[PDB]
C-alpha cells in the first residue's frame, strides 16, 4: 500500500479580502474584487437573437436555481453578486439580416464599424450567433 499525500485546496481571495475556495460561494458572499460600474452590452445578431439575449439578461437578474443547489451553487442574480448593472435596456444592437470567412466578416465588420464610427461605448460585444 502506497500513501497518498494531500495538497490542501487553495483559497482564492475576494472582496474585503475574504478568501474562499469555490468561485460561486465567494462571489455570492463577498462579491468580486474590483468595482466596475456596469456592463454596456453590445449585441451583434438577428432580431430574434437580440430578443433571446434580452430575455436571458432579464432572467439573469432574478435568482435562478440549479436542480441540486448543494452540489452546484445557485445564482443569486447579477446585481446581487457582482454589484454592477448589466440591464437589457442599455444594449447597443447591431442587426444582421470561404463561407466561414465571410460569415466571420459580417459580424466582424459590424463590430469594427460600431466601435469606430458609433458614439455608443460598449464594454463587451455579445455576438449572439444564430443556429
Amino acid at each position: 500500500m502506497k500513501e497518498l499525500i494531500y495538497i490542501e485546496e487553495p483559497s482564492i481571495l475576494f472582496a474585503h479580502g475574504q478568501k474562499c475556495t469555490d468561485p460561486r460561494d465567494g462571489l455570492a458572499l463577498f462579491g468580486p474584487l474590483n468595482q466596475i460600474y456596469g456592463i454596456k452590452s453590445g449585441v451583434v445578431g438577428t432580431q430574434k437573437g437580440l430578443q433571446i439575449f434580452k430575455s436571458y439578461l432579464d432572467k439573469i437578474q432574478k435568482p435562478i436555481y440549479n436542480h441540486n443547489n448543494i452540489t452546484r451553487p445557485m445564482f443569486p442574480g447579477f446585481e446581487a453578486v457582482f454589484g454592477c448593472k448589466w440591464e437589457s435596456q442599455n444594449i447597443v444592437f447591431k442587426e444582421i439580416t470561404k463561407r466561414t470567412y465571410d460569415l466571420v466578416t459580417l459580424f466582424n465588420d459590424k463590430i469594427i464599424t460600431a466601435n469606430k464610427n458609433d458614439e455608443e461605448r460598449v464594454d463587451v460585444w455579445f455576438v449572439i450567433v444564430p443556429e
Partner: protein
C-alpha cells in the same frame, strides 16, 4: 423583542457591518444596523435608546481597533449592559472582533470577559459560528433562506483526517521469466514472415528473434527453426534490465525494456484469445469483452459484467498495457462495448460512443471497481494470478489484486 442589534464603528468600519446586516436579513433575522436602518431626520440617540432597550433581542459589538474606544459604541455597549442586567439573559451581548491588530488583552473591560465570536480572518466561518450561537440561544422564505444558510455552513467544508483505502487500476507483475532470449534465426526464419502471427510472443530485433520463449517452441508455424543451435541465442536476466543495471552495446537498456513491454502486450493479446472473450477495436489497441449468455445470470462474483440498455446490449471490457516505469506493472482501462443483440457488434462507432456515454452517465466509482475487479478475476486461472503464455516453460503472472493505495485525508460519503 425579536430584533438583533449591531453596534459598530460608524466612520470607518461600515463594510463588515453592512455585509453582516444584509446576510442576517437574508437569513430571516430582524436587524437594526444603524447605517442601514437609522431613519433620516429622527433623533438618532433616542432611536438608539428605543431600539436597544425595548425590542433588542441580542446586542452585537464590532470589536475592531477603531471601536472599543469610540464614544458612540461605548455608550451603546454600556446601555446594552444595562439591558443585560434588566433582562437577566446570559450573553445578551455578542462581541464580534474583525480586526487582527488588537489582542484579547487590549479589548475594553466592558466586554473582555464575554467571549467574542471569531471574525479575524474568515467572515463566512465567523458568520456560521454566529448563526450557531444564535441557534443555541434560540434567537428567532422557507425554501429561499435554507440555501443561504446551508451555503454559510458548507463554504468551509474540508476533508476529514481519516484513513481511506483505494483499489487502483494497475495490476502488478508478480514474476517474470528468468531469461529474455535472442534466437539467431538468420535464415531459418523467413524474412517476410509476420512474427505477430507466431503462436508465442516474439519480435524481430537486430537480425535476432527476441522473446521469452524457448527457441524450439516456434515449430508448428516455423518448421525450419528446428535444429537451431542454442549457443547462438543470447540470454539476458529479466530482472537485470528491469532494475536497469544491465546496459550493453548490443541492446540498450531502455530499448530492451520497450521490447519486454511489447512482449507483455503481445502475450496478453494472445492469451485473451484463449480466455473465452471476444475482441473489439479502439483506435489505439484491443478491448476484451465477454459475450452475453456466456456468464451465469450475466454475473461473476456478484458483479454483472454484461447487461441491457435501450434495446441494446452492453458488455464490460478491458484493455491492458504493460509498463515498467514505477514498477513492472500492467495498466488496465475500462470500456463498455455495445452490441445489437448480445452476439453481434454494432458496426457504426458513433452509436457506440453515444451508448457508452449513456451507460457511464450513472456508473460511478463503486460500479467501475466491482466490474473491473470481477473481470480481472474472471480471466484469472488461479486465485491470485493471471497467466500469460510467453513460453512452453515460462509464463507471465499478473496479480489479481491491484496496487492498493491509502491516504490520511478523506470525507464522509453523502447518504
Amino acid at each position: 423583542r425579536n430584533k438583533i442589534f449591531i453596534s459598530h464603528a460608524t466612520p470607518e468600519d461600515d463594510d463588515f457591518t453592512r455585509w453582516l446586516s444584509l446576510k442576517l436579513i437574508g437569513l430571516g433575522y430582524e436587524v437594526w444596523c444603524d447605517i442601514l436602518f437609522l431613519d433620516k431626520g429622527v433623533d438618532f440617540w433616542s432611536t438608539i435608546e428605543k431600539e436597544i432597550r425595548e425590542n433588542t433581542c441580542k446586542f452585537l459589538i464590532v470589536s475592531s481597533t477603531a471601536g472599543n474606544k469610540r464614544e458612540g459604541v461605548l455608550k451603546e455597549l454600556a446601555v446594552a449592559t444595562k439591558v443585560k442586567k434588566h433582562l437577566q439573559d446570559d450573553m445578551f451581548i455578542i462581541p464580534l472582533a474583525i480586526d487582527e491588530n488588537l489582542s484579547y488583552d487590549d479589548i475594553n473591560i466592558e466586554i473582555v470577559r464575554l467571549n467574542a465570536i471569531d471574525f479575524k480572518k474568515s467572515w463566512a466561518k465567523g458568520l456560521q459560528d454566529l448563526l450557531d450561537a444564535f441557534e443555541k440561544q434560540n434567537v428567532p422564505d422557507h425554501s429561499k433562506s435554507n440555501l443561504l444558510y446551508q451555503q454559510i455552513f458548507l463554504h468551509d467544508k474540508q476533508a476529514i483526517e481519516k484513513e481511506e483505502t483505494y483499489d487502483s487500476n494497475w495490476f502488478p507483475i508478480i514474476s517474470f521469466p528468468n531469461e529474455l532470449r535472442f534466437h539467431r534465426y538468420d535464415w531459418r526464419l523467413p524474412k517476410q514472415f509476420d512474427v505477430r502471427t507466431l503462436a508465442f510472443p516474439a519480435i524481430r530485433y537486430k537480425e535476432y528473434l527476441c522473446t521469452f520463449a524457448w527457441e524450439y517452441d516456434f515449430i508448428h508455424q516455423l518448421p525450419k527453426t528446428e535444429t537451431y543451435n542454442g549457443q547462438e541465442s543470447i540470454r539476458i536476466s529479466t530482472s537485470d534490465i528491469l532494475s536497469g543495471r544491465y546496459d550493453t552495446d548490443f541492446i540498450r537498456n531502455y530499448e530492451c525494456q520497450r521490447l519486454i513491454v511489447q512482449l507483455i502486450n503481445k502475450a496478453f493479446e494472445l492469451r485473451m484469445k484463449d480466455k473465452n472473450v471476444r475482441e473489439y477495436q479502439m483506435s489505439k489497441t484491443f478491448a476484451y469483452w465477454i459475450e452475453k449468455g456466456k456468464l451465469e445470470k450475466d454475473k461473476f462474483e456478484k458483479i454483472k459484467l454484461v447487461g441491457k440498455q435501450k434495446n441494446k446490449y452492453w458488455h464490460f471490457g478491458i484493455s491492458a498495457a504493460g509498463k515498467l516505469y514505477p514498477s513492472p506493472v500492467l495498466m488496465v482501462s475500462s470500456h463498455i462495448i455495445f452490441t445489437m443483440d448480445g452476439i453481434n457488434l454494432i458496426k457504426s462507432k458513433s452509436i457506440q460512443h453515444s451508448s457508452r456515454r449513456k451507460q457511464g452517465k450513472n456508473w460511478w466509482n463503486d460500479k467501475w471497481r466491482e466490474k473491473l475487479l470481477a473481470f480481472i478475476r474472471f480471466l484469472s486461472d488461479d486465485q491470485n494470478a493471471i497467466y500469460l503464455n510467453v513460453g512452453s516453460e515460462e509464463k507471465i503472472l499478473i496479480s489479481n489484486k491491484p496496487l492498493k493505495f491509502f491516504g490520511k485525508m478523506s470525507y464522509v460519503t453523502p447518504s
